[PDB]
Design an enzyme around this catalytic site. Structure first.
Site, PDB file in Angstrom:
ATOM      1  N   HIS A   1      41.350  35.375  33.047  1.00  0.00           N
ATOM      2  CA  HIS A   1      41.533  35.393  31.597  1.00  0.00           C
ATOM      3  C   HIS A   1      41.597  33.990  31.002  1.00  0.00           C
ATOM      4  O   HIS A   1      42.525  33.641  30.274  1.00  0.00           O
ATOM      5  CB  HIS A   1      42.771  36.206  31.215  1.00  0.00           C
TER       6      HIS A   1
ATOM      7  N   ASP B   1      37.539  40.071  34.871  1.00  0.00           N
ATOM      8  CA  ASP B   1      38.422  39.620  33.784  1.00  0.00           C
ATOM      9  C   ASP B   1      38.550  38.096  33.794  1.00  0.00           C
ATOM     10  O   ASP B   1      39.632  37.527  33.923  1.00  0.00           O
ATOM     11  CB  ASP B   1      39.801  40.300  33.849  1.00  0.00           C
TER      12      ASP B   1
ATOM     13  N   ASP C   1      38.654  36.027  27.776  1.00  0.00           N
ATOM     14  CA  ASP C   1      39.617  36.556  26.808  1.00  0.00           C
ATOM     15  C   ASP C   1      41.041  36.093  27.086  1.00  0.00           C
ATOM     16  O   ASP C   1      41.399  35.793  28.231  1.00  0.00           O
ATOM     17  CB  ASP C   1      39.614  38.087  26.762  1.00  0.00           C
ATOM     18  N   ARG C   2      41.853  36.082  26.025  1.00  0.00           N
ATOM     19  CA  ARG C   2      43.298  35.839  26.056  1.00  0.00           C
ATOM     20  C   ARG C   2      43.633  34.372  26.264  1.00  0.00           C
ATOM     21  O   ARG C   2      44.374  33.795  25.461  1.00  0.00           O
ATOM     22  CB  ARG C   2      43.981  36.687  27.129  1.00  0.00           C
TER      23      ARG C   2
HETATM   24 MN   LIG Z   1      42.973  41.678  32.649  1.00  0.00          MN
HETATM   25 MN   LIG Z   2      41.281  44.400  33.215  1.00  0.00          MN
END
Ligand SMILES: [Mn+2]
Ligand SMILES: [Mn+2]
Length: 293
Positions: free
Chosen positions: A60, A86, A89-90
């Site tokens: 992330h 992942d 994002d974030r």
């Molecule tokens: Mn995640």
């Molecule tokens: Mn996830």
């Protein structure tokens, strides 16, 4: 495409104040996307991998924690790597994170592997940070280029016919591994079905069978579902990610499943560690852990 120049610039900020950017050119990032996409499509959507390797959960956009993971585990290709998705994002530096990972995939395509997370999906990363990073630091055309690449990522991996790996978890529609292999690419992540569940489902200790998932997507599954899956397919371990866990890793169903999460201090309002699983030649699992601040 000057791969070693790209990797050199991305690694240059090692030891800097966390947050210092690495700004590649638009053409360099487009080349990373186009070439990595070709490699992903040339390899199976269900990877068949060998130990030893190191396995990583969610990143992330925490680029400086990604660098710490490589510093602890050995920079590619000193160790083989499997990431469970992942990447964006974030966090604050999704761009540096995904660019380093794609560069290592192009440079070491048989020793470095990336699976698709549920955030490698335009409808999700439009809202959760990656689109905003691309718009601010590059342009939206580059974001679409990233999307075309994400849509070709493999979905699952089996290590030495014994460790089944995906971002989310099991599916009530997953009866045969051939079902995964028949999934065609490029594809978006559907709102239901096998591909959705492999990126979205969660194990749950208080569920018997298959339950409703609080995310509003996919399902939850219990320990009996895991045991039946391992017995049917002659496997020893499910290795997945997707959920924040305090120690960076967490076993489930009498150590028949493990959850990995590699982004420590997630979002700022999580006091979690990040963990990377080391799998030796005989599939014995240990952990390297980024303790919380
Ligand atoms: Mn995640
Ligand atoms: Mn996830």
């Amino acid at each position: 495409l000057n791969l070693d120049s790209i990797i050199g610039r991305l690694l240059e900020v090692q030891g800097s104040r966390p947050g210092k950017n690495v700004q590649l050119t638009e053409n360099e990032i487009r080349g990373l996307c186009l070439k990595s996409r070709e490699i992903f499509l040339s390899q199976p959507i269900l990877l068949e991998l060998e130990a030893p390797l190191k396995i990583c959960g969610d990143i992330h956009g925490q680029y400086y924690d990604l660098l710490r993971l490589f510093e602890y585990g050995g920079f590619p290709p000193e160790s083989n790597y499997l990431f469970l998705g992942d990447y964006v994002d974030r966090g604050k530096q999704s761009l540096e994170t995904i660019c380093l990972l794609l560069a290592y995939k192009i440079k070491y395509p048989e020793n470095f592997f990336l699976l698709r997370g549920n955030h490698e999906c335009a409808s999700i990363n439009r809202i959760k940070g990656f689109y905003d990073e691309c718009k601010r630091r590059y342009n939206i055309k580059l974001w679409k280029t990233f999307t075309d690449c994400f849509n070709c990522l493999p979905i699952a991996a089996i290590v030495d016919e014994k460790i089944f790996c995906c971002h989310g978890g099991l599916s009530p529609d997953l009866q045969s591994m051939e079902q995964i292999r028949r999934i065609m690419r490029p594809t978006d992540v559907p709102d239901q079905g096998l591909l959705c569940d492999l990126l979205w489902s969660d194990p749950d200790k208080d569920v018997q069978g298959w339950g409703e998932n609080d995310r509003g997507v996919s399902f939850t599954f219990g320990a009996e579902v895991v045991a039946k899956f391992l017995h049917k397919h002659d496997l020893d371990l499910i290795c997945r990610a997707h959920q924040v866990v305090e120690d960076g890793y967490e076993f489930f169903a009498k150590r028949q499943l493990v959850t990995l999460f590699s982004a420590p201090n997630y979002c700022g309002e999580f006091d979690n560690a990040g963990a990377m699983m080391s799998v030796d030649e005989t599939l014995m699992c240990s952990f390297q852990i980024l303790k919380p601040a």
